[PDB]
């Protein structure tokens with residue numbers, strides 16, 4: 565099964581998923597000097613006031629906080645996006661050490677972790693049909709650095725002990741993802757892919773420039789999760805990030821001058 569180890573990690577994924585070597589793979593390094601301000605980007609709208617979280621799941625590669633996406637509640641609009649994109653789940657990627665863990669990099673800098681808020685384009689009806697489309701998904705990516713604690717993250721941290729191993733889930737209602745956002749919505753955007761198999765090239769990436777700060781204690785609790793299932797030998801869930809992929813025939817646009 566695909567994973568992050570030596571025998572099944574990112575450098576092996578192309579055998580089962582040949583699109584791994586495709587023309588619009590993610591993540592990428594964001595070269596800040598080459599990214600160009602784009603005055604055609606409309607204001608970005610993150611409208612999470614009515615979000616309904618449901619559950620948190622350890623899927624063996626990360627943990628997902630899942631949302632009720634059965635109507636227009638938590639949505640992303642504006643910026644590079646045509647139309648309305650509905651929040652379905654968020655998850656993180658993180659390292660074994662604070663010096664690595666992000667998937668995107670900024671002038672080759674690796675952050676300690678990266679949050680992905682995953683949204684699907686409502687014109688396609690369901691997530692499954694959206695991932696058959698070149699503009700099916702929008703992922704809002706937010707870097708994490710280690711410093712002061714993020715209060716809005718603590719409820720996530722505290723439930724992780726109950727989903728330690730692959731296949732475990734827990735109720736996770738009334739979680740407000742607004743508490744995971746930095747002050748500024750300045751961003752970079754480019755067309756890319758899912759960063760895990762099946763690596764589908766359906767994503768408009770929107771990567772915020774301002775990281776959030778989380779405490780060492782918070783990220784240390786991420787690193788206590790397990791990739792393995794209950795009763796199997798413990799393999800800590802760390803370094804669940806794909807490295808930067810070739811930019812190829814793409815441009816990264818900036819929302820800010």
Ligand SMILES: CCCOc1ccc(S(N)(=O)=O)cc1
Pocket residue numbers: 680682695703757758759760761762
């Ligand atoms: C098609 C089912 C998998 O869905 C996702 C896989 C990876 C991401 S990421 N890491 O690019 O945000 C999002 C959805």
Ligand SMILES: OC[C@H]1O[C@@H](O)[C@H](O)[C@@H](O)[C@@H]1O
Pocket residue numbers: 600815
């Ligand atoms: O041909 C000129 C155009 O080249 C494109 O690659 C850039 O994205 C545009 O911003 C520029 O105006």
Ligand SMILES: [Zn+2]
Pocket residue numbers: 655656657680759
């Ligand atoms: Zn992700």
